[PDB]
Amino acid sequence: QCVNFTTRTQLPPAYTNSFTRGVYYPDKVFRSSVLHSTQDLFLPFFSNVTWFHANPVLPFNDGVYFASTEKSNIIRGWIFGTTLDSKTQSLLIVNNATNVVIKVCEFQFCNDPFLGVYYMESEFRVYSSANNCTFEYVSKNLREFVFKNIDGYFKIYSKHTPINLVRGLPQGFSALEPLVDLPIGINITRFQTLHISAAYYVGYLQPRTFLLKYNENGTITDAVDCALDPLSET
Amino acid sequence: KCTLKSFTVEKGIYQTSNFRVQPTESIVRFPNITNLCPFGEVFNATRFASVYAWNRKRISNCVADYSVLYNSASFSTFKCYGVSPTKLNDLCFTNVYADSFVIRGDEVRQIAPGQTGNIADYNYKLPDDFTGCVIAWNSNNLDSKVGGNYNYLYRLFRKSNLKPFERDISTEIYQAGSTPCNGVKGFNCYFPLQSYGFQPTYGVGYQPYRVVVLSFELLHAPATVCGPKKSTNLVKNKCVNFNFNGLTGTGVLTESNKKFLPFQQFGRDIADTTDAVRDPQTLEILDITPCSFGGVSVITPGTNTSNQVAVLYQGVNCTEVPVYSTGSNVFQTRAGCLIGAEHVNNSYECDIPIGAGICASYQSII
Amino acid sequence: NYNYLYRLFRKSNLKPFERDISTEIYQAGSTPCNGVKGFNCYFPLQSYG
Ligand SMILES: *[C@@H]1O[C@H](CO)[C@@H](O[C@@H]2O[C@H](CO)[C@@H](O)[C@H](O)[C@H]2NC(C)=O)[C@H](O)[C@H]1NC(C)=O
Ligand SMILES: *[C@@H]1O[C@H](CO)[C@@H](O[C@@H]2O[C@H](CO)[C@@H](O)[C@H](O)[C@H]2NC(C)=O)[C@H](O)[C@H]1NC(C)=O
Ligand SMILES: *[C@@H]1O[C@H](CO)[C@@H](O[C@@H]2O[C@H](CO)[C@@H](O)[C@H](O)[C@H]2NC(C)=O)[C@H](O)[C@H]1NC(C)=O
Ligand SMILES: *[C@@H]1O[C@H](CO)[C@@H](O[C@@H]2O[C@H](CO)[C@@H](O)[C@H](O)[C@H]2NC(C)=O)[C@H](O)[C@H]1NC(C)=O
Ligand SMILES: *[C@@H]1O[C@H](CO)[C@@H](O[C@@H]2O[C@H](CO)[C@@H](O)[C@H](O)[C@H]2NC(C)=O)[C@H](O)[C@H]1NC(C)=O
Ligand SMILES: *[C@@H]1O[C@H](CO)[C@@H](O)[C@H](O)[C@H]1NC(C)=O
Ligand SMILES: *[C@@H]1O[C@H](CO)[C@@H](O)[C@H](O)[C@H]1NC(C)=O
Ligand SMILES: *[C@@H]1O[C@H](CO)[C@@H](O)[C@H](O)[C@H]1NC(C)=O
Numbered sequence: 333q334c335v336n337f338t339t340r341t342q343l344p345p346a347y348t349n350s351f352t353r354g355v356y357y358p359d360k361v362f363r364s365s366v367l368h369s370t371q372d373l374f375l376p377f378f379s380n381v382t383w384f385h386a387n388p389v390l391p392f393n394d395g396v397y398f399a400s401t402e403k404s405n406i407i408r409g410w411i412f413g414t415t416l417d418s419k420t421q422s423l424l425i426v427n428n429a430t431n432v433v434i435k436v437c438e439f440q441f442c443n444d445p446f447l448g449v450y451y452m453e454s455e456f457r458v459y460s461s462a463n464n465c466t467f468e469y470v471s472k473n474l475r476e477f478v479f480k481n482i483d484g485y486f487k488i489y490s491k492h493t494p495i496n497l498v499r500g501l502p503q504g505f506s507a508l509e510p511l512v513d514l515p516i517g518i519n520i521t522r523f524q525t526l527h528i529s530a531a532y533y534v535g536y537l538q539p540r541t542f543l544l545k546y547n548e549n550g551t552i553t554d555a556v557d558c559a560l561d562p563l564s565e566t
Numbered sequence: 567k568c569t570l571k572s573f574t575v576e577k578g579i580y581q582t583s584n585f586r587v588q589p590t591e592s593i594v595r596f597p598n599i600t601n602l603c604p605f606g607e608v609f610n611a612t613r614f615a616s617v618y619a620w621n622r623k624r625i626s627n628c629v630a631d632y633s634v635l636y637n638s639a640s641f642s643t644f645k646c647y648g649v650s651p652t653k654l655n656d657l658c659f660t661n662v663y664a665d666s667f668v669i670r671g672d673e674v675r676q677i678a679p680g681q682t683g684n685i686a687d688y689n690y691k692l693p694d695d696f697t698g699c700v701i702a703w704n705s706n707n708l709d710s711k712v713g714g715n716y717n718y719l720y721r722l723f724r725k726s727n728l729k730p731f732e733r734d735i736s737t738e739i740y741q742a743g744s745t746p747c748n749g750v751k752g753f754n755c756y757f758p759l760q761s762y763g764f765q766p767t768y769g770v771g772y773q774p775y776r777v778v779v780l781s782f783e784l785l786h787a788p789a790t791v792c793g794p795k796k797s798t799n800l801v802k803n804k805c806v807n808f809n810f811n812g813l814t815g816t817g818v819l820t821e822s823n824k825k826f827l828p829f830q831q832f833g834r835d836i837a838d839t840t841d842a843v844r845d846p847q848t849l850e851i852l853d854i855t856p857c858s859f860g861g862v863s864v865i866t867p868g869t870n871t872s873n874q875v876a877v878l879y880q881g882v883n884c885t886e887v888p889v890y891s892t893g894s895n896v897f898q899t900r901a902g903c904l905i906g907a908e909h910v911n912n913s914y915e916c917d918i919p920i921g922a923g924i925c926a927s928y929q930s931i932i
Numbered sequence: 933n934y935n936y937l938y939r940l941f942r943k944s945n946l947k948p949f950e951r952d953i954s955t956e957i958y959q960a961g962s963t964p965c966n967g968v969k970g971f972n973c974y975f976p977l978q979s980y981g
């Protein structure tokens with residue numbers, strides 16, 4: 333139950349720096365006061381991040397780092413898939429106050445998918461039909477997410493932080509805890525973002541090597557990119 | 567003597583072998599069993615569909631206990647073809663297909679690979695390479711009606727047979743002859759669908775029988791559906807071997823005060839060696855220590871002089887010694903545990919070095 | 933010909949170069965056999981068609 337729109341809002345994307353953000357726990361192993369070197373997919377330090385202020389179909393690549401410095405839980409939904417139609421399986425995620433609800437099948441999306449709020453919210457018109465599927469899963473503020481798809485497994489890492497700075501990303505370090513895992517194998521190459529009724533930062537992941545420090549309580553407090561400059565390599 | 571491969575031994579200390587504390591028992595632990603597959607709604611359904619319209623259900627991502635289906639004696643026919651059922655609790659596949667219908671008593675044998683019949687050729691055909699199981703049980707008290715239950719229909723005529731895993735519910739008028747029919751029966755046109763006449767007065771072989779067929783699929787997606795894994799009790803302060811959720815190894819389990827973040831499952835210190843683990847049931851942090859082991863040595867004053875020896879266990883506390891379990895006065899030293907030599911409180915020159923500043927000599931052995 | 937026969941049920945595996953001709957009922961299920969096949973018990977030896 334959706335139609336087209338006339339206010340074709342297209343704000344060109346700006347570019348910003350990444351600083352030292354985009355670090356997550358690679359595994360579920362406790363380590364105390366140790367420097368561990370690991371090779372995996374991370375967001376390189378001091379990279380270029382695409383700032384968006386409608387929403388285009390951005391390619392997924394290997395993984396995606398998605399940040400939103402929003403107020404009062406604006407950013408809600410996520411769409412993943414290859415063709416985003418009834419021809420191929422599609423993935424939809426809706427974030428709520430408690431947790432995220434996930435559905436995996438071919439929902440038929442239109443040009444302007446949005447959830448809609450009624451003033452007590454009751455509206456759902458992102459798609460039109462869904463024939464067959466099996467997997468449904470139910471479980472001021474800067475929200476950081478990392479989305480990965482490795483060998484038939486969909487991984488979502490999340491972190492919430494309070495920030496007061498307005499213009500750019502905070503200059504601090506905070507590891508990302510593992511949040512959600514799905515044992516589903518579906519090819520995904522593109523993803524989108526749901527509209528509401530709004531600025532966000534997007535970055536890509538690359539395979540490289542990092543050095544991580546674990547304190548006495550098993551929390552990551554420092555990370556070093558090996559292949560950045562001669563001092564870091566040393 | 568055997569180690570030296572000689573019949574004479576001169577005075578000194580020699581390393582013969584080594585010992586280790588054997589494990590006592592085995593313990594395996596797994597998280598609490600949950601997410602059982604909904605088998606009740608299939609085998610206890612109010613009614614089943616027709617044989618030509620057999621109902622299909624997909625089962626994935628749940629634990630399926632086949633023991634309850636095995637030990638039930640209410641199933642008149644329980645025939646598993648592809649594999650022996652007893653091992654489905656161990657090995658498993660990625661998907662399950664359940665086909666439910668109702669057939670006559672004499673049609674039970676037709677549900678098998680390499681079988682032919684009206685149902686086997688016009689209603690449901692199974693390939694010779696089919697793997698799975700079939701469960702058929704009488705439902706005379708429910709499906710059969712005193713006035714004649716015609717709610718079940720079966721195909722009677724078709725030009726060709728049915729492909730494996732193919733469902734056809736077409737109501738096209740079968741044309742046996744060459745005279746076309748425009749939707750009306752005639753001399754050579756008959757309705758392929760016939761209604762069953764199940765009644766309580768019908769004898770054996772005519773009573774309605776509910777049949778459910780389970781098939782297993784192993785698509786490249788990871789396997790998710792099979793029986794639960796049993797768990798055992800937990801013991802402490804004993805060198806045993808453990809199988810904590812796939813993490814297998816021996817050692818002694820003690821209590822630990824280390825703190826884990828709520829998303830880890832086990833920890834390690836350095837060189838990738840397990841140090842602590844959290845049990846998946848009570849969610850507490852234990853501690854793993856390798857139970858004691860070490861080499862042994864024999865101190866002798868020479869075969870020519872005497873024929874008695876002393877035994878030294880290197881770096882082993884004098885609490886777990888085990889025929890030489892008592893011997894003489896047992897002495898505990900920093901180097902290890904000494905058996906067969908008494909301890910004096912004098913001080914002379916060193917003859918056969920032992921370690922940690924002490925050594926023994928022959929007077930008995932002191 | 934039904935003079936050819938082979939075992940198909942057994943409690944466990946066989947050691948190398950070992951022959952067993954024990955013609956005893958097999959307790960396939962949890963129901964005890966007590967010398968009668970009934971249910972969950974079958975003859976371990978089957979012939980050749
Ligand atoms: C609805 O069910 C059909 C039939 O099971 C699904 O088709 C499967 O699609 C996957 C896609 O990779 C194949 O690997 C399977 O082999 C297909 N099944 C069969 C029996 O061929 C379909 O994906 C399901 N969902 C829909 C149609 O949205
Ligand atoms: C590691 O965690 C422990 C347990 O919470 C911390 O110890 C307490 O931490 C709180 C707040 O961080 C303090 O108010 C208490 O005084 C601490 N008590 C003790 C006995 O230390 C500890 O601070 C954390 N960090 C480190 C480096 O150990
Ligand atoms: C269908 O319903 C019957 C009757 O409730 C189930 O049989 C019972 O199974 C439980 C299992 O714990 C036993 O304790 C009862 O004694 C059984 N009752 C009878 C009358 O046999 C049967 O398990 C159900 N089928 C499925 C697939 O759940
Ligand atoms: C997993 O383990 C048991 C499974 O039953 C449960 O935990 C305890 O269960 C016993 C009896 O079932 C209760 O008396 C205890 O009060 C339970 N303890 C807790 C902390 O719940 C429970 O299902 C699971 N426990 C945990 C810690 O996950
Ligand atoms: C050998 O084991 C015994 C226990 O079987 C140890 O004695 C304990 O030592 C600890 C630490 O010194 C004390 O807290 C306990 O009270 C002692 N228990 C008893 C019953 O004495 C002994 O220390 C161990 N020896 C060595 C060398 O480690
Ligand atoms: C990103 O690239 C643009 C040009 O492509 C550049 O102007 C901008 O400074 C870059 N952002 C950085 C280096 O943070
Ligand atoms: C989000 O969805 C969950 C699952 O349906 C629900 O329990 C929760 O109340 C929802 N949050 C809302 C509506 O804010
Ligand atoms: C993904 O694409 C590859 C390449 O064609 C194919 O082999 C694989 O089966 C696909 N998997 C899914 C889930 O579509």
Ligand SMILES: *[C@@H]1O[C@H](CO)[C@@H](O)[C@H](O)[C@H]1NC(C)=O
Pocket residue numbers: 870871
């Ligand atoms: C044993 O010792 C005695 C006394 O010194 C000596 O006479 C004898 O030859 C020795 N025998 C051997 C085999 O060493």
Ligand SMILES: *[C@@H]1O[C@H](CO)[C@@H](O)[C@H](O)[C@H]1NC(C)=O
Pocket residue numbers: 909910911912
């Ligand atoms: C060891 O020292 C104690 C301390 O008084 C003494 O009584 C004992 O006699 C000494 N041992 C020997 C063998 O003399």
